[PDB]
Design a protein around this motif. Structure first.
Motif, PDB file in Angstrom:
ATOM      1  N   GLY B  22     -21.009  64.446 -11.373  1.00  0.00           N
ATOM      2  CA  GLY B  22     -21.848  65.472 -12.251  1.00  0.00           C
ATOM      3  C   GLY B  22     -21.036  65.952 -13.435  1.00  0.00           C
ATOM      4  N   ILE B  23     -22.340  66.283 -13.819  1.00  0.00           N
ATOM      5  CA  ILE B  23     -22.109  67.284 -14.771  1.00  0.00           C
ATOM      6  C   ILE B  23     -22.982  68.270 -14.784  1.00  0.00           C
ATOM      7  CG2 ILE B  23     -23.310  67.365 -17.525  1.00  0.00           C
ATOM      8  CD1 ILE B  23     -22.719  64.417 -17.807  1.00  0.00           C
ATOM      9  N   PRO B  24     -22.737  69.752 -15.373  1.00  0.00           N
ATOM     10  CA  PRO B  24     -23.287  71.245 -14.705  1.00  0.00           C
ATOM     11  C   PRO B  24     -24.443  71.635 -15.885  1.00  0.00           C
ATOM     12  CG  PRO B  24     -21.021  71.696 -15.329  1.00  0.00           C
ATOM     13  CD  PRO B  24     -21.032  69.889 -15.601  1.00  0.00           C
ATOM     14  N   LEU B  29     -24.609  75.577 -11.488  1.00  0.00           N
ATOM     15  CA  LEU B  29     -23.462  76.509 -11.495  1.00  0.00           C
ATOM     16  C   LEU B  29     -22.938  76.781 -10.147  1.00  0.00           C
ATOM     17  CD1 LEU B  29     -23.122  78.109 -14.855  1.00  0.00           C
ATOM     18  CD2 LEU B  29     -21.804  76.004 -13.999  1.00  0.00           C
ATOM     19  N   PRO B  30     -23.622  77.413  -9.968  1.00  0.00           N
ATOM     20  CA  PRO B  30     -23.796  77.587  -8.148  1.00  0.00           C
ATOM     21  C   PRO B  30     -22.869  76.924  -7.242  1.00  0.00           C
ATOM     22  CG  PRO B  30     -25.382  79.464  -9.389  1.00  0.00           C
ATOM     23  CD  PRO B  30     -25.409  78.055  -9.700  1.00  0.00           C
ATOM     24  N   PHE B  32     -22.303  74.234  -8.613  1.00  0.00           N
ATOM     25  CA  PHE B  32     -20.936  72.702  -8.550  1.00  0.00           C
ATOM     26  C   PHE B  32     -19.978  73.626  -8.109  1.00  0.00           C
ATOM     27  CE2 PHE B  32     -21.165  69.632 -11.564  1.00  0.00           C
ATOM     28  CZ  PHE B  32     -22.820  69.414 -11.270  1.00  0.00           C
ATOM     29  N   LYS B  33     -19.694  75.140  -8.585  1.00  0.00           N
ATOM     30  CA  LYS B  33     -18.818  76.615  -7.800  1.00  0.00           C
ATOM     31  C   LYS B  33     -18.867  76.184  -6.332  1.00  0.00           C
ATOM     32  CE  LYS B  33     -17.698  81.338  -7.405  1.00  0.00           C
ATOM     33  NZ  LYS B  33     -17.421  82.491  -7.567  1.00  0.00           N
ATOM     34  N   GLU B  36     -16.572  72.686  -6.182  1.00  0.00           N
ATOM     35  CA  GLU B  36     -15.402  72.718  -6.560  1.00  0.00           C
ATOM     36  C   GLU B  36     -14.391  73.310  -5.346  1.00  0.00           C
ATOM     37  OE1 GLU B  36     -14.077  75.281  -9.935  1.00  0.00           O
ATOM     38  OE2 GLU B  36     -14.073  73.309 -10.612  1.00  0.00           O
TER      39      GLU B  36
ATOM     40  N   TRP C 457     -17.281  72.602 -22.277  1.00  0.00           N
ATOM     41  CA  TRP C 457     -18.469  73.008 -22.122  1.00  0.00           C
ATOM     42  C   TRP C 457     -18.032  74.669 -21.804  1.00  0.00           C
ATOM     43  CZ3 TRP C 457     -18.900  69.208 -17.415  1.00  0.00           C
ATOM     44  CH2 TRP C 457     -18.970  67.988 -17.705  1.00  0.00           C
ATOM     45  N   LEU C 460     -21.219  77.070 -20.587  1.00  0.00           N
ATOM     46  CA  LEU C 460     -21.069  77.085 -18.914  1.00  0.00           C
ATOM     47  C   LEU C 460     -19.809  77.693 -18.251  1.00  0.00           C
ATOM     48  CD1 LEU C 460     -21.721  73.258 -18.256  1.00  0.00           C
ATOM     49  CD2 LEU C 460     -23.696  75.543 -18.914  1.00  0.00           C
ATOM     50  N   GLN C 464     -19.920  81.394 -16.278  1.00  0.00           N
ATOM     51  CA  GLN C 464     -18.868  81.339 -14.666  1.00  0.00           C
ATOM     52  C   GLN C 464     -17.546  80.576 -15.172  1.00  0.00           C
ATOM     53  OE1 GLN C 464     -21.253  79.732 -11.648  1.00  0.00           O
ATOM     54  NE2 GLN C 464     -19.527  77.780 -11.856  1.00  0.00           N
ATOM     55  N   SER C 467     -14.312  78.597 -12.866  1.00  0.00           N
ATOM     56  CA  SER C 467     -14.580  77.222 -12.986  1.00  0.00           C
ATOM     57  C   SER C 467     -13.775  76.453 -13.706  1.00  0.00           C
ATOM     58  CB  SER C 467     -15.686  77.057 -12.784  1.00  0.00           C
ATOM     59  OG  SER C 467     -16.702  77.365 -11.721  1.00  0.00           O
ATOM     60  N   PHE C 469     -14.198  72.833 -13.816  1.00  0.00           N
ATOM     61  CA  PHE C 469     -15.066  71.901 -13.733  1.00  0.00           C
ATOM     62  C   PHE C 469     -15.216  71.462 -15.597  1.00  0.00           C
ATOM     63  CE2 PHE C 469     -18.325  74.247 -11.640  1.00  0.00           C
ATOM     64  CZ  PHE C 469     -18.959  74.149 -12.286  1.00  0.00           C
ATOM     65  N   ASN C 470     -15.371  72.913 -15.953  1.00  0.00           N
ATOM     66  CA  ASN C 470     -15.787  72.835 -17.141  1.00  0.00           C
ATOM     67  C   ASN C 470     -15.085  72.999 -17.890  1.00  0.00           C
ATOM     68  OD1 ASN C 470     -17.788  76.233 -16.215  1.00  0.00           O
ATOM     69  ND2 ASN C 470     -18.603  73.535 -17.075  1.00  0.00           N
TER      70      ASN C 470
END
Ligand code: TPW
Ligand code: TPW
Ligand code: TPW
Ligand code: KPV
Ligand code: KPV
Ligand code: KPV
Ligand code: KPV
Ligand code: KPV
Ligand code: KPV
Ligand code: MG
Ligand code: MG
Ligand code: MG
Lengths: 533, 535, 533
Positions: B22-24, B29-30, B32-33, B36, C457, C460, C464, C467, C469-470
């Protein structure tokens, strides 16, 4: 060579076998009715209320295995025929609905037009739900092809179609309508299907051929009578199929109605290991009444241009193509006892019961009277008709919508060439459409109508007898007959019934209404069981 | 109870999903959080959404299970429509999970960034490329909807769509139960199997042709067994290349009509018992003519139906039919691969690449699964020894290659993947290799570089627009964390391949310079056949 | 006189102002690309991936306030452009999507065709959701009228349209395409609307003219600059509208971004009692960032051919018609201090921050360099561009879809007549579509691209930050530039940045990529507030 659009449509209909056009005009449809009346391409018969226009056209289509034609005006006319057309769709009758409509340039002046629905296209959208093909003839260049496509669909699928004609297009110049578009048939698939069907019928110990509507819709009654003869198998009709093969040398053994029909026919059908449902509607009215659960997956079912058996389906197999294919594989033939008809009416001072009506009718036939085609409404009149000798029968045996009877008898007699129609209808149904009999004089017909008057919606009382809303008043229908131009007589005793029926058959020139008073709670043998089970 | 997002991830893992690509975006975001933080499914990010869909598609194909592609509303989802249409066409169960505005957003008279004409536009678009959809905007019904939707993806083996409003991500729900049951009539199945078996035994030259559904439903071992008990040869469709790779007796070859091996083609087209097992009836699999195949005379099991003898048995799962056939059967000359690469100073032609790859396998190297894009790279791969192969052999959409290789290796537990891709396709998605380091993978990529959209040149050689520039892909490999080498002679090609295989840790890009006008015989004949077809 | 369909379409596009055609071929589209290449009616520019085809065409349309043209092949091409087209639809850019498709007689041989969706019409259905008009040109007789209708809709509504061309129709003979169908305008309604608007602006104590996209879409920038001058009212652009009126004698005071923009402009806007939203998209990006809640119902809003004010709406009022009507009621004119641009870059050994990039660009302009049109992707690059001196700006300020930047700069420069485009884009976005720069040499363009590389990124992370993943890797984009035919240089200090920008402007012939390394967490002043609020 060109011609006016309306004239081209009328001629296209006649070329396809249409014998008349039923309708009620309105301002949007006036130009069209004018062409219909003045050209006389199709005899124009008007009625009182649109439901009857729909039923009469449906009946005419059933009578001649051809297209029926129903013409109405925009909105108030067309929407008033939705129920009759939904019924024709359900029972596969090719009724061509022709509605007048605002001209292509109307409705652009900022004003709503009388008869329109939410939008000008609302009517079209509604008819798409109850027809198999539709076209608004608003383009002269495309009209011939659209007419052929729509009429072609009605004939191939044997279901209603819709044609909307903007009034300014009625006299637009167009080219003559050509032939129906062809619907391809894979010869190899038809051959394989026929071979498998024949093998299955041949391997069955107790095979049964059950005929339903499509057998007459596609004009296959004679060939199907021959098919059964060649296979050496008995024929039984579905409930909806009552009236089929009335002219076959060997009539069907009877009509399957499960727990409500004859025990032997029910046994033969439900215990059959070779049940061929030929052109059948798989309705609760035809099969939910089974005593023993019938595994439809173990039958052979040909319907809607397909054939299903052995858990698989052959698509695009026309019923006529299948019947011809089977006959081609069967050499000419080089018999179970039929269900007996109720007879021996006791014409005394006793009260009338539905079965007495069946006996009265059957007795005259047995005495020498050629049977009449029967038009039945929904009610105990239909369950009673199941025990009557007929020269065909038309009834809403699946859609089960009341009001069908009188108008159907009227439509049929309009194209019967002098033959009288016998109509059976209850008091509930007569209150809805029986009044159409007031048109018989102008239409030039004299149907015999037996009205079952039990001052009640009896079928419903039988389903829920505790309720009081099924109680109806005692309308004096025979007394009202004169007002409509016919001869009415109320009968209360079996002797009066017999006498009444005899005079009606001896009196032509005007419709004959025999109002048979029947006590509440008194039902046909068939209907009782149908509920008592 | 548990959070809706967590309930969905567990439901996916319960069904075999192995990762989440994926790509957020702000709306996602919620979600993806949660992904993760719970670590229910490893979360792999890529550079551009097309790759997210291709990677999820590849992972689904690799494990015959659900693939998972998570994106953000609009800008994310719409950018994945092409990859999903391809997964739909090629029957890969990609579960598309998109973030969306909260159930109470969009009511303040303002349009929301990423929305289409209406907030529901995205949903309407996805209905066209998925077999089931659900907007999880009701916690009470969410568990059942997830089960219904994921169940449809498994049964039909096609993509599905789940739209999750932002404020529902952490909403409380009951766990997700099992997929709704898709009833199968045992009497119909028995009759179907009896007819098929009889037809195959009646044939003098029966042929088992396998295609995608054989892998989608995990039937390769059973089908290999089926072929053995029937004593019939197995051939794959063009799309089906890569099937039965580790069967004791592999397929004789792959059918490509006038473009494939003449013996295979003759066997297929002369067969009086052609059983198309799980086959897509595409122009690519069958229009490669020679002698018109009457499809009505074949036995075709596909999309939960079976057609033969001009009739169809509905609701017959391929797995059910294969099991039924095996229950009725008591236990009971392959097309050669091109070899002999001449490691000399001559230029590289497509076939030389296949020889280089095959020579290594014959020398002792266990074959690698091949990920191929659409182009001559695919037609060349038809002649390569593989441990399975995934390619867009029906949808034919470019860009699948590199992302698919990446997605497969992410779930291959250490096994290296070989990717073949042309310069045109690499320009589209080859860049995703820049994600290898973070993903912990090191695929070997052979880039066929002819500075041309060569397949199109072949179709219309007079056009100038098929001439592309020469991009120095090997020179750009370092910038993405990989090792690149440009090769022009067959000797350089051989050395580069050996070097790539002996080098783990970084993706290995071998940029093979192929001259314009030089194409595999398979592609040449394929295109020539097409031209005569439409003549 | 007739001509081939494809040629007629290309000519119809050129007649409407199209300046080029962007595309990527496929077998279904080969016949069409052949006609495009050989006739040279529209310069044909190919790219690497379809998203770029969509963005480039969108940019070309924005650049010249005319139709943009994007040609692709069936399925794999078209579906790969849905996102860029959804974006053009959202930001009102008239992109004409032309897709090749199977011939009208293909797909009837029992085989599925490569690139088709569930059905052959699936693609058409999908594009109906992201375009205002569509047509499959499968009937030569109707093609001219359909082209005019579809192209007419694109110009009137300034949104994308879809044309599907079966390949066997490419060379079919057709008549030349006529004029766009006319869209009626009630002169009395326009007069009433203009009178009410003028009275409202005149009665306001602190009126403000806020310009947005439609002002350039319909080519009204000059007239609107004149309108503000005549009304004596300040002009501010919406966030999406950044770049508007760049050539007006009196530039807008600034760009409204609520809590994230200049406090004075935010105050003027939100406290205005005469806020005229001229051609504005009512998006969260333009108005959700308000400090004080803005009652949209108290504004005057002209958009989508309608005007709303005083709680009522005037339908069918074209923006151009309204602007002309207002000017006609205003005599020629016989001033607030603008928001200052960040300047004074300190070219030392310190690290680079987004504002330093804005200062570097602004300093060269102040020193004598004519500003360049700016193409921005979505990311902090856009929030930074908000503080840059430009000669217009194009960015996805509403749809907010990444990938827009490089391809937009490319499309714009293809039709810029020699003028260079300045492109700002982040590392995330560059990974998506920055690679299209490899086409600059063949296209004959040399854009200057400033790549904001924070290996993240960042937008993003800001939303948040907890996280992980950014987090992105550090791609060596400058090192990869050579492989694509351009000059790349990575800069880490403010001094290197200034030096890099100077050399790029002094070097034409190939694209110049200035990869500016920016630490994570370092943002533009605008973006910080945009989130810090
Ligand atoms: C148009 C329509 N509206 C209501 C109904 C529902 C119904 C089914 S049967 C019945 C009573 C019929 O009474 P009838 O006197 O005609 O004959 P009988 O029962 O033997 O006494 C009704 C109202 C149907 N089928 N169609
Ligand atoms: C997303 C998409 N857009 C366009 C196309 C149409 C196409 C089919 S083949 C081809 C040329 C491919 O060039 P490549 O260098 O990759 O390989 P090769 O031909 O052997 O030189 C194109 C553009 C497809 N299939 N998908
Ligand atoms: C096609 C698409 N997919 C995902 C997203 C969601 C997003 C909005 S902002 C962002 C990060 C951009 O990183 P970049 O390096 O380019 O610039 P910066 O933030 O200043 O570091 C993403 C992924 C959008 N808008 N479009
Ligand atoms: O003819 C019909 O169908 C009518 O109902 C007439 C309604 C009266 C009428 C209203 C508006 C225009 C013309 C006539
Ligand atoms: O369609 C029906 O109403 C039926 O009952 C099937 C028989 C129809 C029918 C038979 C004979 C003459 C006229 C009509
Ligand atoms: O995160 C994404 O997907 C974006 O595009 C960010 C766009 C910026 C944004 C605009 C309006 C509200 C909230 C955020
Ligand atoms: O689905 C495809 O792309 C095919 O070529 C069919 C074989 C797929 C496949 C085989 C072995 C491992 C992984 C995938
Ligand atoms: O040209 C394109 O768009 C392609 O993807 C070519 C795919 C190969 C192809 C398949 C079937 C018929 C003709 C060609
Ligand atoms: O549409 C957009 O992207 C905007 O920002 C509005 C300004 C567009 C624009 C202005 C000047 C030249 C080219 C384009
Ligand atoms: Mg009654
Ligand atoms: Mg190439
Ligand atoms: Mg960044």
């Amino acid at each position: 060579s060109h011609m006016k659009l309306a004239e081209a449509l009328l001629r296209a209909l006649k070329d396809r076998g249409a014998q008349a056009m039923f309708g009620i005009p309105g301002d949007f449809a006036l130009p069209f009715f004018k062409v219909a009346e003045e050209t006389q391409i199709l005899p124009l018969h008007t009625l009182s209320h649109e439901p009857a226009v729909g039923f009469a056209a449906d009946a005419a289509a059933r009578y001649s295995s051809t297209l029926g034609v129903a013409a109405v005006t925009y909105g108030a006319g067309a929407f008033n025929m939705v129920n009759a057309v939904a019924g024709a769709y359900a029972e596969k009758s090719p009724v061509v609905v022709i509605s007048g409509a605002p001209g292509t340039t109307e409705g652009n002046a900022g004003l709503l037009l009388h008869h329109q629905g939410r939008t000008l296209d609302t009517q079209f959208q509604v008819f798409k739900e109850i027809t198999v093909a539709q076209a608004r003839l608003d383009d002269p260049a495309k009209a011939p092809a659209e007419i052929a496509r729509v009429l072609g669909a009605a004939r191939a699928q044997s279901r209603p179609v819709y044609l909307e004609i903007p009034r300014n297009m009625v006299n637009a110049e167009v080219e003559p309508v050509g032939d129906d578009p062809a619907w391809p048939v894979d010869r190899d698939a038809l051959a394989a299907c026929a071979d498998e069907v024949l093998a299955a019928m041949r391997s069955a110990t107790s095979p049964v051929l059950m005929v339903c509507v499509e057998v007459r819709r596609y004009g296959l009654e004679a060939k199907v009578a021959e098919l059964a003869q060649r296979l050496g198998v008995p024929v039984v009709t579905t409930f909806m199929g009552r009236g089929l093969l009335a002219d076959a040398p060997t009539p069907p053994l009877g009509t399957y109605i499960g727990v409500a029909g004859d025990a032997e026919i029910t046994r033969l059908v439900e215990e059959s290991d070779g049940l061929f449902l030929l052109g059948a509607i798989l309705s609760d009215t035809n099969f939910a009444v089974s005593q023993r659960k019938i595994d439809l997956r173990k039958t052979i079912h040909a319907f809607d241009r397909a054939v299903t058996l052995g858990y698989h389906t052959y698509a695009d197999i026309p019923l006529a193509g299948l019947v011809d294919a089977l006959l081609e594989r069967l050499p000419p033939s080089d018999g179970k006892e039929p269900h007996a008809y109720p007879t021996g009416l006791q014409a005394d001072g006793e009260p009338i019961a539905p079965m007495d009506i069946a006996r009265a009718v059957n007795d005259r036939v047995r005495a020498g009277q050629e049977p009449l085609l029967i038009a039945a409404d929904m009610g105990d009149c239909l369950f009673t008709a199941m025990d009557m000798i007929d020269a065909g029968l038309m009834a809403p045996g699946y859609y089960a919508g009341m009001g069908f009877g009188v108008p159907a008898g009227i439509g049929a007699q309009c194209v019967s060439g002098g033959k009288r129609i016998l109509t059976v209808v209850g008091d509930g149904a007569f209150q809805m459409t029986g009044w159409e009999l007031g048109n018989c004089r102008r239409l030039g017909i004299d149907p015999i109508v037996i009205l079952f008057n039990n001052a009640s919606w009896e079928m419903l009382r039988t389903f829920q007898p505790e309720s009081a809303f099924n109680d109806l008043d005692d309308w004096r229908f025979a007394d009202m007959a004169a007002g409509m131009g016919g001869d009415g007589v109320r009968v209360r005793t079996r002797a009066e019934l017999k006498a009444a029926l005899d005079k009606a058959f001896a009196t032509r020139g005007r419709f004959q209404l025999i109002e048979a008073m029947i006590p509440r709670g008194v039902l046909s043998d068939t209907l009782a069981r149908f509920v008592q089970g």
